[PDB]
C-alpha cells in the first residue's frame, strides 16, 4: 500500500499502486485506490481497505451535498476537513488513513494528509505501509519549480521504488494529473516501471 501526491505550479500529481492484499495473499492485484470525491477532488485510499472504502462514500455523500448547495466545486480544504472529522471522531472503530488532494480555483493544487486524525498542508505527501521506506528519495531529489514532466517522473520514481521495497505494494502505477483544464488518468504497465539499481 503506497500513495503519493506532489504539488507543482499548474496542479498536483497523485499516484497509487494497484496491489490490494489482505494478509499475505493478494485479494486483487489490479485495483484503483483513487476514489473521486468530485471532478477535481480525489482521495487516495490507504490503511484498512474496508474502512477506507466506507469513509470514501461517507465523504462523497457530504461533499456532493456541499458542492450542490454552493453550485461550485468545493475547496480542497473543505474536502480535507470532512475526512478528518470522520477520522478523528470515529477513529475508535475506524483505523483507515486517507490522503486528500485536488485542485480549486482559489489556491490551485493542494495536498492534505488526513492520516491519524490531524490535518496539515504539504508540497508533497506520501502515505501507506510503503511510504516509510521512500523518505530518502522524496527528500533529497525534490527540487522547487519542477515541470509537469519532471513531476510525473519524480512521482513515478518514488512509487516504483516503494513497490520494490514494500512487500504489500505492487501491480501497476496509477497516475492522476489534476489541473485547471481537467484531469488526466494514466496507467504505467509493469514494463514501463523505471528501472533502478538491480543488484
Amino acid at each position: 500500500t503506497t500513495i503519493m501526491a506532489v504539488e507543482f505550479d499548474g496542479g498536483v500529481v497523485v499516484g497509487s499502486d494497484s496491489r490490494v492484499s489482505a494478509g499475505e495473499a493478494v485479494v486483487n492485484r489490479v485495483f484503483d485506490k483513487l476514489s473521486p470525491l468530485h471532478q477535481h477532488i480525489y482521495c487516495a485510499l490507504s490503511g484498512s481497505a474496508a474502512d477506507a472504502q466506507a469513509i470514501a462514500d461517507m465523504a462523497a455523500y457530504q461533499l456532493e451535498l456541499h458542492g450542490m448547495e454552493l453550485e461550485e466545486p468545493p475547496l480542497v480544504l473543505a474536502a480535507a476537513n470532512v475526512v478528518r472529522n470522520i477520522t478523528y471522531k470515529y477513529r475508535e472503530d475506524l483505523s483507515a488513513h486517507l490522503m486528500v488532494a485536488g485542485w480549486d480555483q482559489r489556491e490551485g493544487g493542494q495536498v492534505y494528509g488526513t492520516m491519524s486524525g490531524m490535518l496539515i498542508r504539504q508540497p508533497f505527501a506520501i502515505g501507506g505501509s510503503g511510504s516509510t521506506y521512500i523518505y530518502g528519495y522524496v527528500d533529497a531529489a525534490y527540487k522547487p519549480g519542477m515541470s509537469p514532466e519532471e513531476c510525473r517522473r519524480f512521482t513515478t520514481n518514488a512509487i516504483a521504488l516503494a513497490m520494490k521495497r514494500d512487500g504489500s505494494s505492487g501491480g501497476v502505477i496509477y497516475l492522476a494529473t489534476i489541473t485547471g483544464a481537467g484531469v488526466d488518468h494514466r496507467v504505467i504497465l509493469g514494463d514501463e516501471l523505471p528501472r533502478f539499481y538491480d543488484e
Binding site: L70, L77, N81, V82, R84, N85
Partner: peptide
C-alpha cells in the same frame, strides 16, 4: 467550521 474547517460563505449561511 467544526465540519469543513473554514468560514461559511454568505450564500451558504443564508440558506
Amino acid at each position: 467550521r467544526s465540519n469543513f474547517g473554514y468560514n461559511i460563505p454568505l450564500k451558504h449561511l443564508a440558506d
